[PDB]
Write a protein that binds this ligand. Structure first.
Ligand SMILES: *C(=O)/C=C\c1ccc(O)cc1
Length: 125
């Protein structure tokens, strides 16, 4: 497995070297979102929670079509503020209920080492 703990401070440095496959060995959900909310990466872990297909939701809008349940001031609002601000590192509990059993999860959002890329790590709680 890809040994890298959830919530690690230097996670974007460690993760900035993993291809898709490399990214599928993680013990938690990982999503790469561009500046507009377009899915750049989607690993198998999150798929296992949301039931979506990693290869299927690539290139689609996450807040608009993939995960509308995150279209709120509590998810989206924080994201845009971060996008616009140029930075963001925030941890929070949340519930994904769209097209699925309500699953009490925890979300960690942080800007990547790259320019306009943002990470959205998720785990069961
Ligand atoms: C709220 O988040 C509902 C559904 C959902 C859809 C896609 C992904 O990746 C997570 C959760």
């Amino acid at each position: 497995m890809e040994h890298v703990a959830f919530g690690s401070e230097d996670i974007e440095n460690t993760l900035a070297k993993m291809d898709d496959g490399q990214l599928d060995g993680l013990a938690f959900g990982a999503i790469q979102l561009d500046g507009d909310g377009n899915i750049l990466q989607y690993n198998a872990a999150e798929g296992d929670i949301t039931g979506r297909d990693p290869k299927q939701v690539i290139g689609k809008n996450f807040f608009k079509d993939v995960a509308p349940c995150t279209d709120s001031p509590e998810f989206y609002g924080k994201f845009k503020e971060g996008v616009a601000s140029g930075n963001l590192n925030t941890m929070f509990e949340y519930t994904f209920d769209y097209q699925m059993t309500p699953t009490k999860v925890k979300v960690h959002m942080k800007k990547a080492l790259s320019g306009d890329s943002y990470w959205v790590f998720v785990k069961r709680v």
